[PDB]
Amino acid sequence: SSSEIKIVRDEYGMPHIYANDTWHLFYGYGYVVAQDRLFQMEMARRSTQGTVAEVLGKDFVKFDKDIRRNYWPDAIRAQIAALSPEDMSILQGYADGMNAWIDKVNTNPETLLPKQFNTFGFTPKRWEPFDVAMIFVGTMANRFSDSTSEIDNLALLTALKDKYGVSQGMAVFNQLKWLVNPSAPTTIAVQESNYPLKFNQQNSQT
Amino acid sequence: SNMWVIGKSKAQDAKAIMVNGPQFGWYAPAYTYGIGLHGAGYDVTGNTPFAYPGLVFGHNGVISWGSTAGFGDDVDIFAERLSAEKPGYYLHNGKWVKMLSREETITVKNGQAETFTVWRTVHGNILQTDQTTQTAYAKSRAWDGKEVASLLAWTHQMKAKNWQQWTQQAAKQALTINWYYADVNGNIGYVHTGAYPDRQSGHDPRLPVPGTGKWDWKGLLPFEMNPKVYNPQSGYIANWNNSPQKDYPASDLFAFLWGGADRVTEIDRLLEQKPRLTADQAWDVIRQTSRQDLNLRLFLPTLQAATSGLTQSDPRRQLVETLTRWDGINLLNDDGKTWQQPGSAILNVWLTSMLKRTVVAAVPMPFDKWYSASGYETTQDGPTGSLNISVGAKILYEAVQGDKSPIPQAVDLFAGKPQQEVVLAALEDTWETLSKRYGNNVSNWKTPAMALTFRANNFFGVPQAAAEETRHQAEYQNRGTENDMIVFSPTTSDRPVLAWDVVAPGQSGFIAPDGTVDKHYEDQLKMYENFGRKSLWLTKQDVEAHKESQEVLHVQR
Ligand SMILES: O=C(O)Cc1cccc([N+](=O)[O-])c1
Ligand SMILES: [Ca+2]
Question: Using H for helix, E for strand and C for coil, what is the string for A72-110?
Answer: CHHHHHHHHHCCCHHHHHHHHHHHHHHHHHHHHHHHCHH
> Are the CB atoms for B482 and B22 separated by under 8 Å?
yes
Residue B232 has its nearest CB partner, among A112, A120, A189, at A189
CB contact under 8 A, A184 and B262: yes
Q: How far is B473 from chain A (nearest CA, A)?
A: 21
Largest CA distance in chain A: 77
Cα dist from B545 to A9, B536, B537, B541, whole Å: 11, 13, 10, 6
Give the CA radius of gyration of chain B.
26
Taking CA atoms, what residue in B is nearest to A161? B364
Pairing of strands B42-49, B114-120: unpaired
Residue A137 is which amino acid?
Answer: V
Cα dist from B482 to A170, B48, B212, B505, B540, whole Å: 42, 10, 46, 10, 25
Residue B434 is which amino acid?
Answer: L
Cα dist from B399 to B355, B407, B410, B419, whole Å: 11, 9, 11, 9
Of A145, A34, A49, nearest to B460 by C-alpha is A49
- Superfamily of chain region A1-147: Penicillin Amidohydrolase, domain 1 (1.10.439.10)
Best of B231, B241, B246, B469 to mutate (most A CBs within 10 Å, chain A):
B246
3-class state of residue A121 by DSSP: coil
Strand ranges for B211-364 from DSSP E? 228-230, 236-239, 338-339
DSSP state letter for B518: P
Burial of B73 (0-12, 13-18, 19+ CB in 10 A): buried
CB contact under 8 A, B513 and A115: yes
Strand ranges for B268-392 from DSSP E? 338-339
* Protein residue with its CA nearest to atom 3 in ligand 1: B69
Q: How far is A20 from chain B (nearest CA, A)?
A: 5
3-class state of residue B204 by DSSP: coil
Taking CA atoms, what residue in B is nearest to A21? B40
3-class state of residue A19 by DSSP: coil
Largest CA distance in chain B: 84
Of B53, B44, B185, nearest to B484 by C-alpha is B44
Strand order in the sheet with B32-39: B228-230, B188-192, B177-183, B63-69, B57-59, B42-49, B32-39, A15-18, A4-10, B547-554
Q: How far is B488 from chain A (nearest CA, A)?
A: 21
B523 is in an annotated binding site: no
Q: How far is B310 from chain A (nearest CA, A)?
A: 33
So where are chain B's domains?
Answer: 1-72+146-290+452-536, 73-145, 291-451
> Are the CB atoms for B202 and B214 separated by under 8 Å?
no
Strand ranges for B211-318 from DSSP E? 228-230, 236-239
Q: Kind and range of the H or E element at B324?
A: helix B315-325
B1 assigned to active site: yes
How many angstroms does the Cα of residue B213 sit away from the middle of ligand 2? 17
Distance CA B399, CA B413 (A): 7
A32-A34-A36 Cα angle (round to 5)? 70
Cα dist from B295 to B23, B375, B387, B478, whole Å: 20, 9, 11, 14
B177 pocket-lining for ligand 1 (C-beta < 6 Å)? yes
Distance CA B354, CA B302 (A): 12
Distance CA B522, CA B529 (A): 12
Q: List the resolution, Å.
A: 2.4
Burial of B468 (0-12, 13-18, 19+ CB in 10 A): exposed
DSSP bridge partners of B114:
B106
Experimental technique = X-ray
How many angstroms does the Cα of residue B268 sit away from the middle of ligand 1? 20
Neighboring chain B residues of A150 at a CB cutoff of 8 Å: 76-77, 206-208, 252
List the end-to-end C-alpha distance of chain A, in Å, as a whole number.
66
How many angstroms does the Cα of residue B157 sit away from the middle of ligand 2? 29
List the end-to-end C-alpha distance of chain B, in Å, as a whole number.
40
Cα dist from A186 to A190, B130, B259, B493, B531, whole Å: 8, 40, 10, 35, 28
Site to probe by mutation for ligand 1, drawn from B4, B52, B68, B179 as the one with most ligand atoms within 8 Å of Cβ, is: B68
> Are the CB atoms for B11 and B276 separated by under 8 Å?
yes
Q: Which ligand neighbours the alpha carbon of B54 most closely?
A: 1
So where are chain A's domains?
Answer: 1-147, 148-177
B32 pocket-lining for ligand 1 (C-beta < 6 Å)? no
Q: Which ligand neighbours the alpha carbon of A177 most closely?
A: 2
> Are the CB atoms for B503 and B47 separated by under 8 Å?
yes
Write out the CATH class of domain B1-72+146-290+452-536. alpha beta
Q: Kind and range of the H or E element at B101?
A: strand B100-106
How many angstroms does the Cα of residue A198 sit away from the middle of ligand 2? 15
Distance CA A27, CA A100 (A): 9
Distance CA B405, CA B402 (A): 6
Distance CA B291, CA B282 (A): 16
Cα dist from B284 to A98, B271, B474, B543, whole Å: 39, 11, 20, 27
> Are the CB atoms for A133 and B151 separated by under 8 Å?
yes
Distance CA A120, CA A105 (A): 16
Of B482, B483, B479, B480, nearest to B19 by C-alpha is B483
> Are the CB atoms for B328 and B297 separated by under 8 Å?
yes
Give long-range contacts, CB 8 A cutoff, 24+ apart: B329-338: B329/B288, B329/B291, B329/B292, B329/B293, B330/B291, B330/B292, B330/B293, B330/B449, B331/B291, B332/B449, B332/B474, B332/B475, B333/B446, B335/B446, B336/B474, B337/B448, B337/B449, B337/B451, B337/B474, B338/B446, B338/B447, B338/B448, B338/B449
Residue A184 has its nearest CB partner, among B260, B362, B537, at B260
Taking CA atoms, what residue in A is nearest to B469? A116
Cα dist from A98 to A41, A48, A147, whole Å: 10, 18, 32
Burial of B81 (0-12, 13-18, 19+ CB in 10 A): middle
CB atoms within 10 A of CB B443: 7
DSSP state letter for B248: P
Cα dist from A132 to A48, B151, B366, B483, B510, whole Å: 10, 10, 42, 25, 20
Distance CA B243, CA A2 (A): 48
Half-sphere exposure of B545 (CA within 13 A, CB side): 8
Distance CA A45, CA B385 (A): 23
Taking CA atoms, what residue in A is nearest to B79? A151
CATH number assigned to the domain with residue range B73-145, chosen from the 4 options 2.30.120.10, 3.40.50.10490, 3.40.50.1980, 1.20.1250.20: 2.30.120.10
Distance CA B318, CA B403 (A): 30
Q: Kind and range of the H or E element at B500?
A: strand B497-502
Cα dist from B537 to A8, B35, B38, B266, whole Å: 11, 10, 12, 32
3-class state of residue A62 by DSSP: helix
How many angstroms does the Cα of residue B141 sit away from the middle of ligand 2? 9
Distance CA B218, CA A197 (A): 15
* Protein residue with its CA nearest to atom 8 in ligand 1: B69
Of B212, B246, B217, B216, nearest to B229 by C-alpha is B246
Cis amide linkage into residue B366, ω under 30° from 0: yes
> Are the CB atoms for A33 and A98 separated by under 8 Å?
yes
* Protein residue with its CA nearest to atom 2 in ligand 1: B69
Distance CA B36, CA B539 (A): 10
B483 pocket-lining for ligand 1 (C-beta < 6 Å)? no
A190-A195-A196 Cα angle (round to 5)? 125
Q: How far is A158 from chain B (nearest CA, A)?
A: 10
Interface A-B, measured as beta-carbon pairs within 8 A, has a size of 461
B256 pocket-lining for ligand 1 (C-beta < 6 Å)? no
Annotate B360-373 with b (16+ C-beta within 10 A) or e (fewer).
Answer: bebbeeebbebbbb
Q: Provide the residue count of chain B.
A: 557
Q: Provide the residue count of chain A.
A: 206
Neighboring chain B residues of A8 at a CB cutoff of 8 Å: 543-544, 547, 549-550
Domain B291-451 fold is 1.10.1400
B431-B437-B439 Cα angle (round to 5)? 70
Gaps in chain A after residue (C–N beyond 2.5 Å): none
Site to probe by mutation for ligand 1, drawn from B4, B5, B18, B24 as the one with most ligand atoms within 8 Å of Cβ, is: B24
Distance CA B118, CA B161 (A): 44
Cis amide linkage into residue B418, ω under 30° from 0: no
Of B178, B179, B452, nearest to B290 by C-alpha is B452
List CB contacts of B519: < 8 A, sequence separation 6 or more: A13, B508
Taking CA atoms, what residue in B is nearest to A25? B39
Residue B77 has its nearest CB partner, among A15, A142, A150, at A150
- Looking at domain A148-177, its CATH architecture is Orthogonal Bundle (1.10)
> Are the CB atoms for B450 and B476 separated by under 8 Å?
yes
CB atoms within 10 A of CB B116: 11
